[PDB]
Amino acid sequence: PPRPSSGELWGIHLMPPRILVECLLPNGMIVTLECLREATLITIKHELFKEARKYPLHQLLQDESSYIFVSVTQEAEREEFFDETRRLCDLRLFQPFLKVIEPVGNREEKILNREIGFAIGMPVCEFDMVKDPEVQDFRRNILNVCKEAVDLRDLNSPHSRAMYVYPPNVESSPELPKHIYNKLDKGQIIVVIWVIVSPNNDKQKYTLKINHDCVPEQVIAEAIRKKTRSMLLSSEQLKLCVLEYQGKYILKVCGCDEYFLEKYPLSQYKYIRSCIMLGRMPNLMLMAKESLYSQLPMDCFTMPSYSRTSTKSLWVINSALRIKILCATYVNVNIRDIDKIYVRTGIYHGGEPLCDNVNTQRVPCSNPRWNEWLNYDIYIPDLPRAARLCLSICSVKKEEHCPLAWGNINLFDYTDTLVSGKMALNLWPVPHGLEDLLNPIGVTGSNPNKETPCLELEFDWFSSVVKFPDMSVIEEHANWSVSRNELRENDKEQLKAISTRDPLSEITEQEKDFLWSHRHYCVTIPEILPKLLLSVKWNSRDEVAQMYCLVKDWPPIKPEQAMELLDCNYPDPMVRGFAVRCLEKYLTDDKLSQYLIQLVQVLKYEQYLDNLLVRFLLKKALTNQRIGHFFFWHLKSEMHNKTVSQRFGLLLESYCRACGMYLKHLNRQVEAMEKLINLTDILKQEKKDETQKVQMKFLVEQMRRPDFMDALQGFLSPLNPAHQLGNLRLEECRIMSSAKRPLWLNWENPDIMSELLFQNNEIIFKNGDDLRQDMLTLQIIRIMENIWQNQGLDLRMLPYGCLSIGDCVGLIEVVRNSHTIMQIQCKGGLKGALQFNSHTLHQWLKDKNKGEIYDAAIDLFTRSCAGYCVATFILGIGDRHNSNIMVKDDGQLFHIDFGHFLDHKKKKFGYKRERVPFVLTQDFLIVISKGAQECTKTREFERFQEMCYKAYLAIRQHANLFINLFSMMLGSGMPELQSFDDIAYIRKTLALDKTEQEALEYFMKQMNDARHGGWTTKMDWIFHTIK
Amino acid sequence: SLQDAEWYWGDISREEVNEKLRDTADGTFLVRDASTKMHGDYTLTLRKGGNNKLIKIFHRDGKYGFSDPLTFSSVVELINHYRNESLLLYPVSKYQQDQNIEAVGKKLHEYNTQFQEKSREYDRLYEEYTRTSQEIQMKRTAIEAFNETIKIFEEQCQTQERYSKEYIEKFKREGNEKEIQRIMHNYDKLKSRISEIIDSRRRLEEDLKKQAAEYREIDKRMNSIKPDLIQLRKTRDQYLMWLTQ
Ligand SMILES: C[C@H](Nc1ccc2c(c1)OCCn1cc(N3C(=O)OC[C@H]3C(F)F)nc1-2)C(N)=O
Ligand SMILES: Cc1c([C@@H](NC(=O)Nc2cnc(N)nc2)C(F)(F)F)oc2c(F)cc(F)cc12
């Protein structure tokens, strides 16, 4: 199984400098050899064979090369160490010992299976021992997607391979909003093309003024025209020279591995649009196509070793559903206090029950035996395809009921077969805080931990193997059900109002029947499909069959709208397939990367391992390495979770089998992260009581060791694979003064023109805190900026990078030239004041932007401040303070640390719910009003309020998208987002049960109250105490 | 007479309606305001077959109802009419909360103090429960690793017994006792090492056996105090509801 600790030996974080390794020779002898913890297996084998000649049977020892080492790893696996360049510490041994053996089997196949297993977290042989035919059918059948994805990469190669490795980092639309177009000099952009001339890197620049919408090949054409401008070529000769060589070069971003390889307008590339808004000069580097294509290796996709009766329709069986509960093996309960136990059962279609729940008779705790046939209030033909049995063993103790162990089963298996015969089910433990007697939202399947309460079951048999009907049968039955509407002016107006309602709105039973009765008129307004589907009686064969036909011929919808149909509320395979079809045809690679967090989460709701969503996401992962990179990390980050280890493990294995050479790069990142996890685990556990100076001494000593220097240098940044992390600047590395003591790392940018982007790349590694909440908040902030910017509202956010890479382990991107509001306050004078001067922030910003650039900095502060005020209000980010708000030297205000704003939402013991009030400090209004004393009434404040009103309504217009993005996250193990009630607060702030004008007035009321609430209270800044 | 009715619950959220409808799974019901903008229009939540269904009470021309025939003069008349049609079953009463102002307040502090002391014990039991569960899974894999380690050393014994077999025959014939005792010194070193490994594995098997029993007893203590913790939460919440009235 996956390793429980990143230690170099079992229960030992670090090996001592020298260690005694028991070497088991091939002649039969046993030699204890002293080795350095950083010694390579090449050195250890050479030293072992020198000492082996001293011991007996030395005549039977062949050459060192003829043998290979073997040992038990901490994953309880017999690993054959093919790569002999590996260090003893990096081998992950269970105990210090190595057997020398004659190598066997296909060496090249075994090397790849080690590399796949290392990146996954678990060994590949674990999947071979799984006897579930669905698990082996997934492994075999999913390779059809992998082979199709690899065939696309070698369709128009080497350009197809180059596009896979370096996808064009572009925005979804080439239309530049008016505020972005107005920043161009008469629609034109001034760019700088660089070329390397001499081997010692003698550079040459070419400043060009070109139209913003020039495709990269037209940029190359203008560079060719400038270089061949004084070569006596006629207007015809030059035109034919330009047209011949424009396709022989490609542009690259100076400082990083981002290439302009596709025919998109230059401005559609995110780097160029960023340069336009920031007013920066784009620095691109020109190079020959063969210079990049020679660097790309053609890694072939070898097929693995694992790649090699009557049936009655469900609707024929006219009978009531019956399930017999035989007995449970045991139950962790005390015979005193608890009187009896029973098995509560229910048939569900997602969270909604299809019928009244049915319990077994109560039996004594010591003898869990029922042998009772339970009859459910639904007939077998009326079972929808996603019908599931949800059960649990409960206790009794007015009368109180409590769940003890829960479990769910798919009533139809992956081959459409209805469950039949006897079957055992190892039950799962009750989650913390779940008081519900059943867990329908919980994982569907038997607990892999077989040392758990096992409940035997029995499903009825019907002479033949019962299978769910074909689409041909369902289509014919739907036409029969219609043979066994009206409309009015109010009906069309009511349908349009219901489609615009947010997903969380309350749909009444009259509205449900109204939508179902006018279901054929609904096709004219396709955005109402989610509301109509909730109105379908899913426990009715006739309504479901008719819905299937409407879904079959339903027109497509926006991907943002189709995403809702993948959350917990829509479990039907026909609805989910419809949603995937919309994403296949309409979701761009920009939006797929944008919403990949949720799309990976909704994979957990799928009933079966092989399905249309996973086949879609794995295809985009294997045909776009930017999508593939985060697809790997979002799945790898949850491999510790035994609930999803097998699902995500099988998926990651299929990804790694065909991702190509990128598996080598991901292993480098995994190695580097394993070392940082182990290093920080020592500081977090044994060396926790030691001083900051003492911990830093240890940190330097360990980071300098060769094993650490090799592992932590020359690898791609997991936060952005376009950034390479070269040599580590050890003098710049430090333990930060923050929660969980995160580690600040610094690397040189090994790019040839690093100087034109960033010389050093800094990342904060944090071990202890759950970063999913920060990741999701930062994603929402990026999506809000994206809405505002697309609408033409220039509000600048800073959604810095954040990536969770394990169980409460992650990376945070460092923003260069930024400081907290308290760091600004302390940097600028102070003199022990207790009350910080409110004008200090304005003065600091004035000094950083003197002269002409002053007005620009104030505008950027106003635009960034306005949107963070709106974002923090809509999301209820009330935990804001002078140490978790930062301002860049250029004036950009942005917020950091979003893991703690929901800690005090709970309300228990009459705390009024702690409503998040809208607030804006006087310090910021002084910056916005350019140092005015009466800052609450200036023309700059007037514009600022107007910025917030427009931005607030722009988010309220797309309220359904934010509700859908959070609704998809409910299935994730995040304790902050479990039920739709945790999202309900966004409806209070966005005022969704009001008109747009009423919501604008509501927001204006909360913003005008914030002026009164921004009280300059006479209290010290350290402890906050009033006289 | 809607304020006098027990089933009318002012302006409660959707979360509190579904919370107050879980064990009551038959035909339990309650009424509340549909929205602040409507005000005069209310909503009726009924249980049905598991899912809590919501039915709106429309209000136009003074008369109330669900469909076109508004044959009801008041909201109270509308609900009382459908109770007689059933003979809807149980109303969620805000007034009915069976146990002076001084006694209700002092005993509420006693139930809150007792609930927080038992909540603290559940946090201690859960922290040790998860710690024990994590340690059990580690010991379970450490046994799998020891089993594979023992299998490797057993294969090494069969390798030594096979290769040394022909050399021992040569040295016995040649009378070279030094080389027989040198090969036996290494064999009895390999065999004693296996004993040390099997002792370590069996030592950990008993730690796992005892930690599994500890885990089962932590889970028994949690499952015995979980019902006590829920009835104390419902008791203290009723004492606070009556204290406000
Ligand atoms: C020199 C240093 N620069 C800096 C520091 C922290 C962050 C940052 C830049 O970039 C913004 C992203 N960021 C995010 C966080 N943190 C966060 O998300 O939670 C707590 C805190 C911790 F990780 F350090 N810290 C930073 C400074 N001003 O002291
Ligand atoms: C859950 C959740 C939310 C909701 N916000 C609040 O509940 N704010 C609030 C209200 N009252 C108090 N006392 N404290 C906080 C909401 F934004 F969705 F509405 O936002 C989240 C977010 F951005 C990221 C995330 F990972 C989870 C969530």
Author numbering:
A (entry chain A): 2 to 309, 322 to 410, 416 to 502, 521 to 1063
B (entry chain B): 327 to 413, 424 to 435, 441 to 586
What did the article's authors report about this structure?
The phosphoinositide 3-kinase (PI3K)/AKT axis is pivotal in the development of cancer, with oncogenic genetic alterations in PI3Kα occurring in approximately 14% of cancers. These mutations are found throughout the PIK3CA gene but are highly enriched at hotspot amino acid sites in the helical (E542K, E545K) and kinase (H1047R/L) domains, though the frequency of PI3Kα hotspot mutations varies across cancers. To test this hypothesis, we developed STX-478, a second-generation, allosteric, mutant-selective PI3Kα inhibitor that interacts with a previously undescribed allosteric pocket within PI3Kα. X-ray cocrystals were generated to identify the binding site of STX-478 on PI3Kα.
Compared with published PI3Kα structures, the cocrystal structure of H1047R with STX-478 revealed that the compound occupies a cryptic allosteric site that forms due to a major conformational shift in residues 936–940, along with other smaller, local rearrangements. Specifically, residues F937 and L938 occupy positions that would directly clash with STX-478. Rearrangement of side- and main-chain atoms of these residues resulted in the repositioning of F937 and L938 to create space for the allosteric site. The benzofuran and trifluoromethyl moieties position at the deepest point of the pocket, anchoring against hydrophobic and aromatic residues. The urea present in STX-478 forms a bifurcated hydrogen bond with the L911 backbone carbonyl and a suboptimal hydrogen bond with the G912 carbonyl. This hydrogen bonding secures the inhibitor's central linker with the pyrimidine positioned closer to the protein's surface. The K941 side chain forms van der Waals contacts across the pyrimidine ring in an orientation roughly 180 degrees from the typical WT conformation of this side chain. The K941 side-chain nitrogen is positioned within hydrogen-bonding distance of the D1018 backbone carbonyl, stabilizing the protein in this conformation. STX-478 was found to be a potent and selective inhibitor of all kinase-domain mutant PI3Kα forms found in cancer, including the most common variant H1047R (IC50 = 9.4 nmol/L), with 14-fold selectivity over WT PI3Kα (IC50 = 131 nmol/L). STX-478 binding kinetics revealed a faster association rate with the H1047R mutant and a slightly faster association rate with the E545K mutant, suggesting that these mutations open the allosteric site more readily, enabling the mutant selectivity of STX-478.
